[PDB]
Amino acid sequence: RRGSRPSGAERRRRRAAAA
RNA sequence: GGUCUGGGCGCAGCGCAAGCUGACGGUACAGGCC
């Protein structure tokens, strides 16, 4: 389970796709 | 005044046998230079 790249500053760009 | 990186940590859902994910925490958190 749970293993891609949730890397903080990179995840930011995906977090900013939920919005 | 300004830029770039990104990691280890915890709760829930279903089985003949095994194994996913969570606008879940986290819009958080750490690090160095200029």
Based on its alpha-carbon atoms, the radius of gyration of chain A, rounded to whole angstroms, reads: 9
**What DSSP line would sit under A1-19, residue for residue?**
---S---HHHHHHHHHHH-
CA of A17 to C1' of B8 (A): 25
Residue A19's nearest nucleotide, by CA–C1', is B23
Q: What is d(CA A13, CA A10) in angstroms, rounded to the nearest whole number?
A: 6
Q: What is d(CA A4, CA A19) in angstroms, rounded to the nearest whole number?
A: 21
Amino acid at A18: A
Strand B proximal residues, A:1-19, Cβ < 7 Å:
1-11, 15, 18-19
Of A16, A18, A11, the closest CA to residue A2 belongs to A11
- Token pair for residue A5? 């790249």
Structure-token match 């990179």, residue found: A10
Amino acid at A4: S
Q: What is d(CA A19, CA A3) in angstroms, rounded to the nearest whole number?
A: 23
Query: According to the entry, how was the structure determined?
Result: NMR
